[PDB]
Amino acid sequence: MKETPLSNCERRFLLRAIEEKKRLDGRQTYDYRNIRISFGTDYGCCIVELGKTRVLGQVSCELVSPKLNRATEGILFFNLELSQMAAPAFEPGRQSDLLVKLNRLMERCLRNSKCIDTESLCVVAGEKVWQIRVDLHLLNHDGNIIDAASIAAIVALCHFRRPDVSVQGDEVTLYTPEERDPVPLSIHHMPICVSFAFFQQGTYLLVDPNEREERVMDGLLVIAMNKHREICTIQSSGGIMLLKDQVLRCSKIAGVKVAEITELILKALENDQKVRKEGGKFGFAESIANQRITAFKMEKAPIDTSDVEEKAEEIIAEAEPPSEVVSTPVLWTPGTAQIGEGVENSWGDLEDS
Amino acid sequence: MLQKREKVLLLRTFQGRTLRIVREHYLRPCVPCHSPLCPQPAACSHDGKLLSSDVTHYVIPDWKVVQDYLEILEFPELKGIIFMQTACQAVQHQRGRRQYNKLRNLLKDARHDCILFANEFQQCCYLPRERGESMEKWQ
RNA sequence: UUUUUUUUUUUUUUUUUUUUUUUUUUCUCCUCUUUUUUUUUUUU
């Protein structure tokens, strides 16, 4: 199946709007759609909602032997994936020219910026070291997949907590959250992507565009730049032909926006840590809105487990026992035996000769 | 203008793996000679540290006299020293980083008569190896 | 007192596909000075 086609009235409508500098959902040019984070119960699990897009991030680590060369570091897989439910079009093996640019954007940003400290993730050298493996999923496609995926990966990596080990002499030992307390990670900086769309040959731009605005646009400019004032990746693409003052304006915009986004992320992580430390209740369950029609709560219930013995007993007692015609096995020659109606002769011989 | 040439190399890695890496080299017409009797100023314009002619002579170690005897060539009475970059490269790739750091401080100093020369980036001082050789003899 | 005739917007649609983080170097390296090494003890 494919996606609904685009009419010739929506294009006209978006472009008269954009010329007039007013958008459908009210937000002005240099605005984001507000964000909403939600944390799981086990560490390294979060749900981010940018506008109406959803991404699920989940980090997990595991212990392997560290290849050959680079004997004193650890490896860091990544695997983006696009879920059929994100949008009708996404299909397991028919969108192979977006997956590549997306995985690449994500990997170049996260792994070349050198914000995670993969130095101090060893146990021995030449021997077992921790191999982390981030995982993100797209749940609902409404435009700007990469900003949401980046914020999700950031929060998921800044909320993980490893296991922990004791190493002394030449001897190993592996603990558990009851034997020893899980340990956080070390994060130098926080590289956060920003995207820009250009409209009618670079004459206008719009910050944080959604999927309809994405079908009436020429090309895209992404600018990933960590906190402080340090740019980390840019990737122009689509159909655009750019100037040189504009790259600088964009860099300013990304600076401002990443400042604000880092404010939000830090505040949310702090509040979450405070909640987890106070001693209150957390998790995916205690996030469902209760002022809303599609949520319901029920404490536990013994249903009545008073009768099952009797029913089972009568059922077993009330049915016909196994019968008693026992069959016989026939022996032809050691190696082959037959049971059933059997064959008339001992074996075939000179049937046709 | 420039004249491309090549340089093969035999790098031995820590795991015992050697390789014939090939690399580049770009000659030039005019390597500055940082002397006060260069018979044409403009072509290089001598934009750096520049000697003043009072000495009787000029002494250039070939490679070893600066490899080990370097500790001699600091006395501010010694005058008129010029270093060939090929000796610097030898000492760097043979004597680690300490001796070389003293040598580069020596160079980067307005107290002595030390300059550096681009032997290997000059168009008729470069010579290619031949059948049967060694670093010492080629050097 | 000025008749009659001079065509026009390409034809076509009912195509198969059995992969998967990365990717590829940089050498040997002088740690300065009262010592053997003190040690019970009690108040946390």
From Swiss-Prot, chain A:
Keywords: Acetylation, Cytoplasm, Disease variant, Exosome, Isopeptide bond, Neurodegeneration, Nucleus, Phosphoprotein, RNA-binding, rRNA processing, Ubl conjugation. It comes from the Eukaryota. Residues 1-268 are annotated as: ARE binding. GO terms for biological process: exonucleolytic trimming to generate mature 3'-end of 5.8S rRNA from tricistronic rRNA transcript (SSU-rRNA, 5.8S rRNA, LSU-rRNA); immune response; mRNA catabolic process; nuclear mRNA surveillance; nuclear polyadenylation-dependent rRNA catabolic process; nuclear-transcribed mRNA catabolic process; positive regulation of cell growth; positive regulation of transcription by RNA polymerase II. Residues 335-353 are annotated as: Disordered. There is a cross-link at residue 297 (Glycyl lysine isopeptide (Lys-Gly) (interchain with G-Cter in SUMO1)). Signal peptide: none annotated. Coiled coil: none annotated. The modification Phosphoserine is found at residues 65, 306, 346. GO terms for cellular component: cytoplasm; cytoplasmic exosome (RNase complex); cytosol; exosome (RNase complex); extracellular exosome; nuclear chromosome; nuclear exosome (RNase complex); nucleolar exosome (RNase complex). There is a cross-link at residue 297 (Glycyl lysine isopeptide (Lys-Gly) (interchain with G-Cter in SUMO2)). It is linked to Pontocerebellar hypoplasia 1D: An autosomal recessive neurologic disorder with onset at birth or in infancy, and characterized by progressive axonal motor neuronopathy, severe generalized hypotonia, respiratory insufficiency, and cerebellar atrophy. Death in childhood may occur. Belongs to the RNase PH family. Component of the RNA exosome core complex (Exo-9), composed of EXOSC1, EXOSC2, EXOSC3, EXOSC4, EXOSC5, EXOSC6, EXOSC7, EXOSC8 and EXOSC9; within the complex interacts with EXOSC3, EXOSC4, EXOSC5 and DIS3. The catalytically inactive RNA exosome core complex (Exo-9) associates with the catalytic subunit EXOSC10/RRP6. Exo-9 may associate with DIS3 to form the nucleolar exosome complex, or DIS3L to form the cytoplasmic exosome complex. This is Exosome complex component RRP45. The chain holds residues 1 to 353 of 439 of the full protein.
Swiss-Prot record, chain B:
It is found in: Cytoplasm. Changing residue 62 to N: No change of exonuclease activity. Component of the RNA exosome complex. The catalytically inactive RNA exosome core (Exo-9) complex is believed to associate with catalytic subunits EXOSC10, and DIS3 or DIS3L in cytoplasmic- and nuclear-specific RNA exosome complex forms. Belongs to the RNR ribonuclease family. Catalytic component of the RNA exosome complex which has 3'->5' exoribonuclease activity and participates in a multitude of cellular RNA processing and degradation events. In the cytoplasm, the RNA exosome complex is involved in general mRNA turnover and specifically degrades inherently unstable mRNAs containing AU-rich elements (AREs) within their 3' untranslated regions, and in RNA surveillance pathways, preventing translation of aberrant mRNAs. It seems to be involved in degradation of histone mRNA. This is DIS3-like exonuclease 1. It comes from Homo sapiens.
